[PDB]
Each structure stands twice: as C-alpha cells, then as structure tokens.
A and B are shown apart, each in its own frame.
Chain A
Amino acid sequence: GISRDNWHKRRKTGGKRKPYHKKRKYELGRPAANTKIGPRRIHTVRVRGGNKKYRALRLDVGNFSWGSECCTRKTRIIDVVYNASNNELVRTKTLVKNCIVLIDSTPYRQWYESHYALPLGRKKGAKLTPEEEEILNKKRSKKIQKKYDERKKNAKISSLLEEQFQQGKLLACIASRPGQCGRADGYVLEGKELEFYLRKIKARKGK
C-alpha cells in the first residue's frame, strides 16, 4: 500500500504537511521484483490505462550486445557480482538496471571464431579438438577476403578479454530493467570500464 506521493513529506521548512487526500489510486507503489536466477517465471501486472507489465521473478537467459565487434546474442547468466548501489544484492544474486553480470562465453566464441578465425580459448592444447578450421583450406579469394580481416585490422581485442575466453566467462552490464520490461538486456564491459570494475572486484574479493 506504499505510496510514492509527496504530500506526506515535509515542506522546505519542516512543518508537517497536513493531509487532505486518503492515499488515492493513481499514486500506488507496488512491492518489488526481487529477481532471481532460476527458470523462467514471469508474473504480469495490470497498469493504469490497461497496459501490461512484466514482473521478472526468476530468469536464466538474457539478450546482450558485444559492443565492439557489433555482435548481439542470446546468452546464459552464470553469476552476479557488484551491484554498485547496494553491497547486499550481490549476495542475493538479484538483477536490477545497473547490475554487473558474469555471462557464459559460448555465443561469442563462435561468432568471432567463424569471422576472425584461428580462434581463442584453447591454452595451446596441442592435441585438442581440431574442429573444421584446418580442413576448409580456403583456396579462393575468401582466404584473401579474410586476410584483411585477419591481420590488417589485426582484430586485437582488449587484452584481458582473452583470459575471460580462456575461462569460459564474460563480464557484462545490464542496461534494461528486469521487473518492468521482462527482459534482462545489456552490454558487455569493454576496455576502460573493464579494467575499472576489475580492480573493484579484485580488491573486494581480496579484502
């Protein structure tokens, strides 16, 4: 029965704002979307004006955008670290608008592998999974197409992002709201704010 209204506040002074409403209809506040990382279970909530609103209760997917190479993929959510507004929802694994999320690295390997090949994340296995890059042999100008892709740009991603792909992880940031639109959509942390939130997580996991 929470009301987000501004008639039970105080004035610029501090004198008690005497009431003349009775907490009307159009000033509700509903209880929150304590969002979890379970299987998909989305409640819907009727709005003023009849519109539809999608409570995110438990979610395991999310559509995120690899911003640099301009890729965007459906992806699994693994782990939730550093909410940056409360240091307590990191425990609860709760998703809000700006909450930094560990993401599994599968749908971003295979885009970059099949476009900018001799791929990443194999630790020099030296006997490990020879999967159809060593068989195609690229007789045509498609090899010479991909030669510009390969070393003229030279496509060096941000240094440490190799190590996330060594590990099967990817550190990203949400930009949508979970409980209001029913999605958890965001973008992948790159470069400067990659190394920013890295030292935040390291020192908070350190001490």
Chain B
Amino acid sequence: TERAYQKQPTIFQNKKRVLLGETGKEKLPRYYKNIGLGFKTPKEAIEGTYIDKKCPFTGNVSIRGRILSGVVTKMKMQRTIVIRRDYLHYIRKYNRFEKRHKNMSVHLSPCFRDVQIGDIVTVGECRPLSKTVRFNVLKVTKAAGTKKQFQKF
C-alpha cells in the first residue's frame, strides 16, 4: 500500500470491471519488467504491493554502464543502504600493496527482504538518483550465513 501523500505507477486502475456484479480479487493489474544481462527478476516484485520510483525491477530506472560489488554495512537510511568495498591498491616504488575502502551508497529495492548487515551484494549503475546515490541493488549473494538457526525468544 502507501503511507505517503500518494503512490501509483503507470497502470490504468479504474478499468470499469463491473458489468454483471462481482467483487472477486482486485489488485491483479500490475506492472512488471526484466533487467537483462543475466539477472532474474524476483517474485517479490510480482506479489509486491509496494510502489517504487527508483527500483530496477519496478520503476523506470534502467541499468547502463558498470557492475561492482560491496558489503552491506549500514541500513539506517530510508530505502537505501551504505555498502563498503575493500580492495588492494598498488604502490609502484615499494612494489607492495595497501588496503583501501570507499563507502558507496546504493538504493535498496525493498523487494530484497532479509538483506541483513554484513552480506555480500552486487550493484549496477544508473542515473543520478540523489546526491550520492548513483548505484542500484542488483543481486544479494549471501543470506548472512545461518539459514537454519533457532534461539531463545
């Protein structure tokens, strides 16, 4: 649903269904989209009642350009997270390496549920979504390990 002033994508809602008299189910007429380059659209997009302006599966924001990686470190931000990406930069003179990291922002499509902090993610390039958000969630590699555990409460 919606908890804002209004959200509704592109689809013509008010189709004048009724000609003999029935309710049935109603939420069926939904938008849907592929993203190509060998990434499957999840079924979270299809039985997702949420509406998004910036999703790669739901919205108009197509993915051009690049492919990069990251690890999801902080999720304290609305509909977007902050990845981190270590790498091994090289120094010429010393003939050795040094670790660096550069924190990026990326718009978290909320179709990816249970994306919990610390798991590996893969991103794709888009338009300038915000001041820092130029990236977009493309695939969630790790389910944060334990797909089995039960604990106290």
Which of A67, A154, A190 contacts B19, CB < 8 Å? A154
Interchain CB contact under 8 A, A152 and B19: yes
Nearest to B5 among chain A residues (CB) is A84
User: Main SS of the interface on chain B?
Assistant: loop
- In the assembled complex, the Cα of A89 lies from the Cα of B16 at a distance in Å of 33
Interchain CB contact under 8 A, B8 and A68: no
Interchain CB contact under 8 A, A192 and B6: no
User: Main SS of the interface on chain A?
Assistant: loop
- Smallest CB–CB gap between B58 and chain A, Å? 19
A158 / chain B contacts, CB cutoff of 8 Å: 14
Interchain CB contact under 8 A, B6 and A153: no
B5 / chain A contacts, CB cutoff of 8 Å: 84-85
Q: Could you tell me which residues of chain A, from 53 to 79, have a CB within 8 Å of some CB in chain B?
A: 67-68
Whether, in the assembled complex, A24 has its beta carbon less than 8 Å from a beta carbon of chain B, the answer is: no
- Smallest CB–CB gap between A196 and chain B, Å? 7
Q: Could you tell me which residues of chain B, from 1 to 59, have a CB within 8 Å of some CB in chain A?
A: 5-6, 8, 12-16, 18-19
Q: Mark A69-108, 1 if CB is under 8 A from B, else 0.
A: 0000000000000001100000000000010000000000
- In the assembled complex, the Cα of A190 lies from the Cα of B8 at a distance in Å of 13
Listed in ascending order, the chain A residues whose CB lies under 8 Å from chain B are: 6, 9, 12, 67-68, 84-85, 98, 152-154, 156-158, 190-194, 196-197
Listed in ascending order, the chain B residues whose CB lies under 8 Å from chain A are: 5-6, 8, 12-16, 18-19, 131-132
